[PDB]
Amino acid sequence: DSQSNGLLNKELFDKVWKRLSCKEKKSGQEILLNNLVQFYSKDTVEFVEKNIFQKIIEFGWEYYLQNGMFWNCYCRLIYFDTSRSYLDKRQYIVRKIWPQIDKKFAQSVLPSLTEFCESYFPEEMDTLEEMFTEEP
Amino acid sequence: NNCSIFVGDLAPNVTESQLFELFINRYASTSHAKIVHDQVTGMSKGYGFVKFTNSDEQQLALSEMQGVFLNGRAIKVGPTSGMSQFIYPVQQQPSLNHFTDPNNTTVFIGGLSSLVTEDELRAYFQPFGTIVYVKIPVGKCCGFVQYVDRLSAEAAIAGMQGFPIANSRVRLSWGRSAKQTALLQQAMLSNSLQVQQQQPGLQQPNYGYIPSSTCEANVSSTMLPGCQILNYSNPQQVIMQGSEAVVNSTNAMLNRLEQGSNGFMFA
Amino acid sequence: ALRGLDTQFLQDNTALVQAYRGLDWSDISSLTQMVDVIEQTVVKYGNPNDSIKLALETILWQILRKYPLLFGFWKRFATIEYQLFGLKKSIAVLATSVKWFPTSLELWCDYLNVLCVNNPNETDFIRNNFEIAKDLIGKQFLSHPFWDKFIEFEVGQKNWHNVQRIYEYIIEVPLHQYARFFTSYKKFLNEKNLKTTRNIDIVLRKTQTTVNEIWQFESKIKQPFFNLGQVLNDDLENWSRYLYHENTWMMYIKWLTKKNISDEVVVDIYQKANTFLPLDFKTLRYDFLRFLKRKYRSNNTLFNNIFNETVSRYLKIWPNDILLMTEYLCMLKRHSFKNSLDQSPKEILEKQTSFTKILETSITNYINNQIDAKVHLQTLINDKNLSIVVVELIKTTWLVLKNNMQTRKYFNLYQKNILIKNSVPFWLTYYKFEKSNVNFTKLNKFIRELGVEIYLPTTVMNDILTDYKTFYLTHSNIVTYESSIIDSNTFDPILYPELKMSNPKYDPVDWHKKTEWKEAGHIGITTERPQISNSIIECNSGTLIQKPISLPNFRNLEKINQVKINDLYTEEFLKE
Numbered sequence: 001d002s003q004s005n006g007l008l009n010k011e012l013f014d015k016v017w018k019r020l021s022c023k024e025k026k027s028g029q030e031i032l033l034n035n036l037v038q039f040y041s042k043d044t045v046e047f048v049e050k051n052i053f054q055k056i057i058e059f060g061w062e063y064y065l066q067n068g069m070f071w072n073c074y075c076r077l078i079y080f081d082t083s084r085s086y087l088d089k090r091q092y093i094v095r096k097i098w099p100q101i102d103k104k105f106a107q108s109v110l111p112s113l114t115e116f117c118e119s120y121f122p123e124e125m126d127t128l129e130e131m132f133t134e135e136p
Numbered sequence: 137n138n139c140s141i142f143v144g145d146l147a148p149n150v151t152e153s154q155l156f157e158l159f160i161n162r163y164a165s166t167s168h169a170k171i172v173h174d175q176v177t178g179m180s181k182g183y184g185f186v187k188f189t190n191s192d193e194q195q196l197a198l199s200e201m202q203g204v205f206l207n208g209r210a211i212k213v214g215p216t217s218g219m220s221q222f223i224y225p226v227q228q229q230p231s232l233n234h235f236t237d238p239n240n241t242t243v244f245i246g247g248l249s250s251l252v253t254e255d256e257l258r259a260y261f262q263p264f265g266t267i268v269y270v271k272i273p274v275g276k277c278c279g280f281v282q283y284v285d286r287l288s289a290e291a292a293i294a295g296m297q298g299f300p301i302a303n304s305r306v307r308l309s310w311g312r313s314a315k316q317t318a319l320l321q322q323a324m325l326s327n328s329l330q331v332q333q334q335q336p337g338l339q340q341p342n343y344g345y346i347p348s349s350t351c352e353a354n355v356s357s358t359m360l361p362g363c364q365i366l367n368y369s370n371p372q373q374v375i376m377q378g379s380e381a382v383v384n385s386t387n388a389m390l391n392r393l394e395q396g397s398n399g400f401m402f403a
Numbered sequence: 404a405l406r407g408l409d410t411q412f413l414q415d416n417t418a419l420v421q422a423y424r425g426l427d428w429s430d431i432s433s434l435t436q437m438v439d440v441i442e443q444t445v446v447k448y449g450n451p452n453d454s455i456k457l458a459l460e461t462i463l464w465q466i467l468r469k470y471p472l473l474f475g476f477w478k479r480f481a482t483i484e485y486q487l488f489g490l491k492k493s494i495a496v497l498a499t500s501v502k503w504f505p506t507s508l509e510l511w512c513d514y515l516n517v518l519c520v521n522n523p524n525e526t527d528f529i530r531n532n533f534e535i536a537k538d539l540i541g542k543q544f545l546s547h548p549f550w551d552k553f554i555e556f557e558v559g560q561k562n563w564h565n566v567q568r569i570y571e572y573i574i575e576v577p578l579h580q581y582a583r584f585f586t587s588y589k590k591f592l593n594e595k596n597l598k599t600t601r602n603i604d605i606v607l608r609k610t611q612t613t614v615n616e617i618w619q620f621e622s623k624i625k626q627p628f629f630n631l632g633q634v635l636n637d638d639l640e641n642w643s644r645y646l647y648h649e650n651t652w653m654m655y656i657k658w659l660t661k662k663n664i665s666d667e668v669v670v671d672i673y674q675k676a677n678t679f680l681p682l683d684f685k686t687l688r689y690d691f692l693r694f695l696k697r698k699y700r701s702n703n704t705l706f707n708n709i710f711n712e713t714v715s716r717y718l719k720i721w722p723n724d725i726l727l728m729t730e731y732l733c734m735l736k737r738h739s740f741k742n743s744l745d746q747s748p749k750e751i752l753e754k755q756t757s758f759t760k761i762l763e764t765s766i767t768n769y770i771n772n773q774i775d776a777k778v779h780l781q782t783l784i785n786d787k788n789l790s791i792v793v794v795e796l797i798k799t800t801w802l803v804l805k806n807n808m809q810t811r812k813y814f815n816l817y818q819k820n821i822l823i824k825n826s827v828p829f830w831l832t833y834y835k836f837e838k839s840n841v842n843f844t845k846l847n848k849f850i851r852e853l854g855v856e857i858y859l860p861t862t863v864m865n866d867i868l869t870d871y872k873t874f875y876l877t878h879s880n881i882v883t884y885e886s887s888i889i890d891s892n893t894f895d896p897i898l899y900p901e902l903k904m905s906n907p908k909y910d911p912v913d914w915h916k917k918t919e920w921k922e923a924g925h926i927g928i929t930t931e932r933p934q935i936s937n938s939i940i941e942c943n944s945g946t947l948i949q950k951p952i953s954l955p956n957f958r959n960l961e962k963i964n965q966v967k968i969n970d971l972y973t974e975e976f977l978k979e
Contacts, residue, residue: 235928236928244972244976246975251787253723259860260861260862261861262862263862263865263904276976278975278976289926290926293926298908299908301858302825303824303825309969310972311976312972389865389869392862392866396827396831397828397831397832398729398828399729399828401726402725403860
């Protein structure tokens with residue numbers, strides 16, 4: 001679709017990943033996370049979600065799992081796809097993202113995820129509420 | 137008037153207190169008196185200046201002290217001030233309205249459609265400079281935008297003029313605050329004086345502040361002149377300018393775009 | 404607005420009705436209308452309503468006076484005098500008075516019986532119970548009042564022990580323990596009573612209101628909460644509100660939420676705070692909306708109607724708000740048309756298409772000025788909050804139904820409208836849609852029109868230009884860039900978003916008569932400064948020596964003292 005490669009170059013992605021590995025010393029962490037999700041394709045969104053986001057899930061670093069803006073950018077990456085339908089990506093985001101995040105780490109994620117859920121997922125509000133309720 | 141008299145050839149044992157006692161409280165009221173001493177020795181050179189408020193009392197003191205006994209010698213209290221081509225220019229005053237005040241930094245905005253809010257009107261006038269309040273009168277289709285800097289008000293008027301807000305052209309001018317407008321309305325209902333008051337200054341010099349500079353958000357500051365040292369907070373207090381300011385502003389504008397794409401704020 | 408002038412007019416009407424010495428039915432109707440206007444415009448405290456209730460009770464209007472007692476109790480919770488007047492009244496009544504005298508008293512038992520000045524209400528209830536031959540009800544009323552910390556606790560206990568000669572010491576140990584607990588509670592509250600009673604004095608200052616003593620009593624009641632802090636905190640909040648304070652109401656709401664109270668009394672307190680406090684607050688309304696959004700998971704039947712009533716009450720008083728329309732649209736998309744992921748996708752797609760068709764029909768009916776009273780969405784859409792409905796329609800159309808030509812047709816249809824051509828989220832949603840596509844021609848058409856015809860706020864324009872400088876440098880090349888450069892308006896998408904940051908208007912490409920030469924040295928005040936037409940300040944003397952220079956041509960030499968000021972502040976705001 002005449003889409004040229006942006007930040008995901010071999011001389012560019014390594015420089016981004018060398019900065020994102022500090023997690024407390026280098027500011028401008030969420031700026032890249034909001035600016036690495038501006039491609040909106042079928043294979044490029046999969047490429048971005050495979051290189052960094054699946055790797056953050058695999059390592060399980062504390063800073064990105066604690067911040068809810070990371071998961072907000074990750075949900076914004078999938079939800080604005082131009083090839084998928086609505087039901088498949090909605091089932092994807094509800095079923096295979098929200099049970100993956102930690103329940104005790106949701107104290108800083110819920111003020112950032114509640115705005116996204118009130119934004120785009122109106123009927124999925126009470127489902128997310130019953131998952132993060134006060135009693136087991 | 138502040139008439140000045142120059143006493144000369146005084147004795148060595150005559151301080152400023154004796155000259156102030158001999159000048160003031162003798163059929164006059166001397167406002168100030170200072171004997172010009174040495175720069176590094178501390179001893180008086182025998183000369184002194186006495187500045188009074190009225191010229192007639194200073195003239196009477198100079199006529200009465202011409203030859204008086206001052207610490208064993210003469211006083212010589214003749215006047216110092218009061219056909220060349222070169223004279224200093226003298227001017228009158230514009231009687232201190234809200235147009236001719238250089239410290240007047242609040243802009244009167246009008247021509248609104250009675251539809252814009254206060255946060256949106258803050259968002260119109262936010263990047264021009266730091267701001268203190270954005271309150272508007274109700275039912276009057278106008279408002280008040282007070283900055284801290286005067287160059288920020290110049291930039292706001294030079295940019296925002298002719299800008300239609302909500303399909304209604306704007307009218308930008310000067311104006312007073314709300315309390316001064318209430319005082320002018322209370323003095324204009326009886327029409328006695330209707331006098332205004334000048335806006336207070338900044339107690340200049342101010343080395344740390346840089347005009348037309350905004351900041352929304354430990355601090356190890358080097359206080360270097362190329363960067364910014366101090367700034368006014370956005371409501372309000374005084375903040376030390378950190379290094380992570382453009383990062384916080386970028387995160388804030390990305391959050392503003394994300395919350396404005398959905399409709400959580402209109403500003 | 405002037406409550407003193409209304410009180411003086413009501414007193415003058417009462418003095419005229421007293422000096423007329425007759426019926427004066429027209430004057431009585433005018434006084435009743437003035438009292439109703441004063442009750443609707445002001446708080447209508449019991450001290451000013453006591454004379455109105457005495458005038459209504461003397462005019463044989465007890466059916467109207469019994470209805471006013473509930474309004475006087477709801478207006479002032481700490482009005483023990485109005486409760487005593489209501490308990491003294493309704494005695495010469497019909498056969499339901501035995502069901503009415505206690506029910507009007509026991510309802511005061513949970514509202515004003517927790518105060519230190521409630522010694523007369525219990526004595527009035529005991530005197531009302533003394534008329535009947537029920538000794539057990541009087542013994543229960545004496546046992547209930549002896550367990551509470553009142554002023555005359557020991558005298559009331561001695562009266563209950565000396566009056567009931569047949570039931571004096573039936574249960575001595577429990578009554579003695581209750582009296583000891585009441586004496587301990589009175590000795591604990593005596594410090595706050597001495598701090599409040601020795602400072603309450605009308606001197607037109609902060610001592611008459613006693614905000615410090617009320618805050619100390621509220622802090623002491625929040626600290627010693629030994630299973631009775633609810634009624635004591637309610638009495639303290641009523642005494643602090645009787646002596647509009649949003650901070651004390653917020654502290655009382657936080658103390659009620661922290662004590663794990665029921666949602667019904669909390670919703671009633673929220674409704675009483677929304678009714679009794681004046682408007683233009685915008686501090687407790689968003690907290691009540693957030694509490695409703697949090698408690699929608701517990702109940703869905705009453706909470707949706709409560710949120711609809713709150714939106715109807717908030718949109719009638721704040722018409723220029725935009726977050727309330729978003730909250731109403733989110734509640735309508737969550738509660739009315741709900742579809743989980745476990746259901747069939749055909750029903751979910753039909754529900755999304757029905758919601759999109761309902762939003763499109765509501766927008767088309769609001770554009771065509773056609774209202775429907777059966778639908779609340781026809782009423783709740785305002786001209787300020789219509790663009791956010793258009794944004795929700797575009798979002799539901801493009802991000803769910805997945806159609807591009809239909810979305811561009813909505814974009815071409817709803818861009819020429821008068822009301823929504825200068826709105827933030829519509830053009831920002833169009834910008835995000837054109838960012839999602841790979842094209843850049845519509846992006847340059849947007850940012851070139853961003854200061855010419857699309858009038859947006861300056862912060863929003865700076866955010867759009869900075870985001871375009873972020874996005875365009877990471878998703879474009881020189882081959883696309885060099886073809887986009889035109890010389891008619893010197894448009895270059897790398898440098899043009901930088902120069903357009905300061906000023907909203909910016910042209911890309913007779914000087915002495917413009918509006919910039921006149922107000923150069925000083926802004927706001929215009930003046931026509933004198934200049935020289937044939938100025939030789941630019942030509943060097945190596946060229947001026949070639950020929951003799953002509954005479955200087957003069958202009959504006961008749962305005963060296965004349966200056967004019969476009970005084971808008973006096974003419975448009977002072978002199979109207």
